[PDB]
Amino acid sequence: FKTEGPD
Amino acid sequence: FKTEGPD
Amino acid sequence: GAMGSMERASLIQKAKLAEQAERYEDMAAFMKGAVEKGEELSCEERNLLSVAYKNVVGGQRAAWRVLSSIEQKSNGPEVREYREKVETELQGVCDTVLGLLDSHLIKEAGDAESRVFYLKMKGDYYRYLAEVATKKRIIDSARSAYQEAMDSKKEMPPTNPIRLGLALNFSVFHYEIANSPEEAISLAKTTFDEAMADLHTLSEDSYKDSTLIMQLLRDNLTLWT
Amino acid sequence: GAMGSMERASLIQKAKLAEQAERYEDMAAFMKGAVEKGEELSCEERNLLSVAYKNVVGGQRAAWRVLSSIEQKSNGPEVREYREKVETELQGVCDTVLGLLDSHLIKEAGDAESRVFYLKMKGDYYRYLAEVATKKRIIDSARSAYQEAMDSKKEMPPTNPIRLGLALNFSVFHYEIANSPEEAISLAKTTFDEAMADLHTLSEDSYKDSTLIMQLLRDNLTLWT
Ligand SMILES: C[C@@H](CN)Nc1cccc2cc(C(=N)N)sc12
Ligand SMILES: C[C@@H](CN)Nc1cccc2cc(C(=N)N)sc12
Ligand SMILES: [Ca+2]
Ligand SMILES: [Ca+2]
Ligand SMILES: [Mg+2]
Ligand SMILES: [Mg+2]
Ligand SMILES: [Mg+2]
Ligand SMILES: [Mg+2]
Ligand SMILES: [Mg+2]
Ligand SMILES: [Mg+2]
């Protein structure tokens, strides 16, 4: 799932 | 320029 | 520290260069050394610290998931041993970041913008530890840090990007780690709705920053409902 | 070595896992340890060694070019110091690979497929050193290794993918390093034309492997003419 900030 | 194998 | 002989300003300059070169392990070591100078960090410097370690631990999480998936399928010692090696390196990075927040970033953070940012990070790095843990005490540490950071609700408007990114990450904690999908959905919905009702107060530039994180809340809610 | 206590078969297995996890520094260390067992490498194992270090040095080259470009634009010591740090790390990786080829991969390689593969690598890692060198002796070392490997022309058909990848890399050496663009173009054209005339001898699977490298020769020639 989407979490804050970069990958 | 293209060289052999991965980047 | 190995960075103890470098000027703080030089470490910050080199962290920015390392970011441009996609050298995230170097960027993290430069920012660790900047933190160990003992001065509080600016907003820009907090963001350099977070981006460096997010990128480093992000590589480790992605590698751990690949190795864990192979290990699960295989059920010699090699797969387990190499997954353990990567897991130990990931735990060490999480412990290093938690060490910086505890010595002494959090205790010296009095403004809402700094204290919520660091407590969100503390929640995130316990969450990363929880992802590989086999574990209850680690989850409660994540929860505790996230909760103190949320209690943002007193000091920041509902569109504040730090407040939004905290709620985003805390909702994922609920869904993925705490096995509380209803709490995850409730938090993401309330956070999105309260932000939408405050967008009218923002400039074009703040509106862009807020709506980018709101779209991440929407993307999760689409996957979850 | 640090890999001296691990079985050769375990190091090879872990290099394959590290590749799946995109952990190329680990993959390179596992393959270094496999080489230091002192046994000759299979075709698959030579390819694991090459892919590991190509990926590691590829990250360093990309970082060095970013830092070099900033340094050139800037014309404090920080940019130069950090470019020097990355350059030294790149030189150390090139020296490690050249060390493995010299102790004792090349001297123990008697088959054309192994000896040309290792001599091509020796040319490539001198080329990487030449890219950051300020240099004539490094260029002549690259040239010498490439030339011995080309002298492939005696033992391999013109479609052999090792022979093709050698000519590809030697043509780029000529164009980019030796300042001999006419030699680069001549080599790429002759190599492409001789391969095209031998394709009729191949299976569907060999044809795919040969034409993939021929397309790289064509892409360069399109940029160069
Ligand atoms: C909204 C905030 C996240 N809490 N993003 C940023 C705010 C201020 C500066 C700054 C610098 C960055 C970099 N060099 N990657 S990211 C960033
Ligand atoms: C044509 C040759 C290049 N000289 N490619 C390969 C031939 C045989 C095995 C093998 C295994 C690889 C990997 N695990 N990335 S790449 C490769
Ligand atoms: Ca291991
Ligand atoms: Ca430096
Ligand atoms: Mg000072
Ligand atoms: Mg463990
Ligand atoms: Mg329900
Ligand atoms: Mg043995
Ligand atoms: Mg130098
Ligand atoms: Mg001409």
Side-chain angles (χ1 to χ4, degrees), chain A, chain B, chain C residues 1-71 74-134 137-153 155-207 209-225, chain D residues 1-71 74-134 137-153 155-207 209-225:
Chain A
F1 306 113
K2 301 314 191 56
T3 51
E4 175 275 323
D7 297 10
Chain B
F1 306 113
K2 301 314 191 56
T3 51
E4 175 275 323
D7 297 10
Chain C
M3 297 300 172
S5 75
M6 203 172 314
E7 288 279 16
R8 188 176 190 284
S10 296
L11 292 165
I12 298 302
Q13 184 178 351
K14 295 184 183 176
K16 293 174 192 168
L17 287 174
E19 184 182 30
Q20 288 180 271
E22 298 186 338
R23 295 267 297 192
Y24 295 105
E25 298 187 10
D26 287 348
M27 188 189 180
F30 292 137
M31 289 313 294
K32 177 173 186 291
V35 167
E36 292 172 347
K37 302 298 180 189
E39 306 263 41
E40 292 183 27
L41 300 195
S42 73
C43 179
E44 184 182 10
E45 294 167 350
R46 297 193 292 269
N47 278 270
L48 291 169
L49 176 70
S50 182
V51 165
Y53 279 108
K54 185 61 184 348
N55 273 279
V56 167
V57 80
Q60 299 170 317
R61 292 166 73 203
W64 186 94
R65 288 191 311 260
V66 165
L67 298 174
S68 196
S69 169
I70 296 168
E71 188 178 14
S74 86
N75 304 336
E78 289 83 357
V79 177
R80 176 191 50 79
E81 288 169 349
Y82 185 48
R83 186 268 301 150
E84 289 178 344
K85 183 200 189 160
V86 170
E87 177 175 307
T88 299
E89 184 190 289
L90 187 159
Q91 291 168 324
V93 168
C94 293
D95 293 341
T96 295
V97 174
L98 293 169
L100 297 171
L101 293 171
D102 202 48
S103 303
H104 300 278
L105 282 179
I106 286 168
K107 75 172 46 67
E108 291 301 351
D111 291 354
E113 291 68 30
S114 65
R115 195 174 177 81
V116 171
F117 185 98
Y118 294 132
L119 286 168
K120 178 191 159 298
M121 282 186 71
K122 176 174 185 164
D124 293 338
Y125 285 85
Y126 276 117
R127 174 160 60 85
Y128 307 147
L129 290 178
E131 285 179 341
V132 308
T134 62
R137 263 184 278 270
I138 295 175
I139 290 173
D140 205 58
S141 292
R143 188 187 311 267
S144 190
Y146 284 136
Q147 190 60 65
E148 180 175 356
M150 289 285 321
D151 297 340
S152 75
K153 290 216 225 189
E155 297 296 341
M156 291 168 162
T159 45
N160 183 285
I162 301 171
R163 180 170 167 178
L164 289 178
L166 166 60
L168 178 72
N169 287 10
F170 194 25
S171 63
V172 167
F173 168 80
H174 286 309
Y175 193 96
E176 251 174 39
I177 310 297
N179 196 39
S180 307
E182 291 180 325
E183 190 67 17
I185 294 160
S186 184
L187 176 56
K189 282 178 168 169
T190 295
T191 299
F192 181 100
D193 292 345
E194 284 194 272
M196 199 173 39
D198 188 56
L199 287 179
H200 76 270
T201 69
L202 303 183
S203 74
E204 180 184 340
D205 274 42
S206 302
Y207 179 92
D209 295 323
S210 298
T211 58
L212 182 93
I213 303 160
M214 289 171 67
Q215 179 63 53
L216 302 176
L217 289 160
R218 176 60 42 205
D219 295 338
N220 287 347
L221 282 167
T222 296
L223 283 166
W224 294 344
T225 64
Chain D
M3 297 300 172
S5 75
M6 203 172 314
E7 288 279 16
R8 188 176 190 284
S10 296
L11 292 165
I12 298 302
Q13 184 178 351
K14 295 184 183 176
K16 293 174 192 168
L17 287 174
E19 184 182 30
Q20 288 180 271
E22 298 186 338
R23 295 267 297 192
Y24 295 105
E25 298 187 10
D26 287 348
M27 188 189 180
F30 292 137
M31 289 313 294
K32 177 173 186 291
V35 167
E36 292 172 347
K37 302 298 180 189
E39 306 263 41
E40 292 183 27
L41 300 195
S42 73
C43 179
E44 184 182 10
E45 294 167 350
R46 297 193 292 269
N47 278 270
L48 291 169
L49 176 70
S50 182
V51 165
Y53 279 108
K54 185 61 184 348
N55 273 279
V56 167
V57 80
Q60 299 170 317
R61 292 166 73 203
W64 186 94
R65 288 191 311 260
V66 165
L67 298 174
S68 196
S69 169
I70 296 168
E71 188 178 14
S74 86
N75 304 336
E78 289 83 357
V79 177
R80 176 191 50 79
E81 288 169 349
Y82 185 48
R83 186 268 301 150
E84 289 178 344
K85 183 200 189 160
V86 170
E87 177 175 307
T88 299
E89 184 190 289
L90 187 159
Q91 291 168 324
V93 168
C94 293
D95 293 341
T96 295
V97 174
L98 293 169
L100 297 171
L101 293 171
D102 202 48
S103 303
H104 300 278
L105 282 179
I106 286 168
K107 75 172 46 67
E108 291 301 351
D111 291 354
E113 291 68 30
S114 65
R115 195 174 177 81
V116 171
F117 185 98
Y118 294 132
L119 286 168
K120 178 191 159 298
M121 282 186 71
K122 176 174 185 164
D124 293 338
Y125 285 85
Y126 276 117
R127 174 160 60 85
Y128 307 147
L129 290 178
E131 285 179 341
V132 308
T134 62
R137 263 184 278 270
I138 295 175
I139 290 173
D140 205 58
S141 292
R143 188 187 311 267
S144 190
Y146 284 136
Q147 190 60 65
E148 180 175 356
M150 289 285 321
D151 297 340
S152 75
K153 290 216 225 189
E155 297 296 341
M156 291 168 162
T159 45
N160 183 285
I162 301 171
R163 180 170 167 178
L164 289 178
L166 166 60
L168 178 72
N169 287 10
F170 194 25
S171 63
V172 167
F173 168 80
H174 286 309
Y175 193 96
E176 251 174 39
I177 310 297
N179 196 39
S180 307
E182 291 180 325
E183 190 67 17
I185 294 160
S186 184
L187 176 56
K189 282 178 168 169
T190 295
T191 299
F192 181 100
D193 292 345
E194 284 194 272
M196 199 173 39
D198 188 56
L199 287 179
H200 76 270
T201 69
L202 303 183
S203 74
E204 180 184 340
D205 274 42
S206 302
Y207 179 92
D209 295 323
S210 298
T211 58
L212 182 93
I213 303 160
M214 289 171 67
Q215 179 63 53
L216 302 176
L217 289 160
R218 176 60 42 205
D219 295 338
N220 287 347
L221 282 167
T222 296
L223 283 166
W224 294 344
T225 64

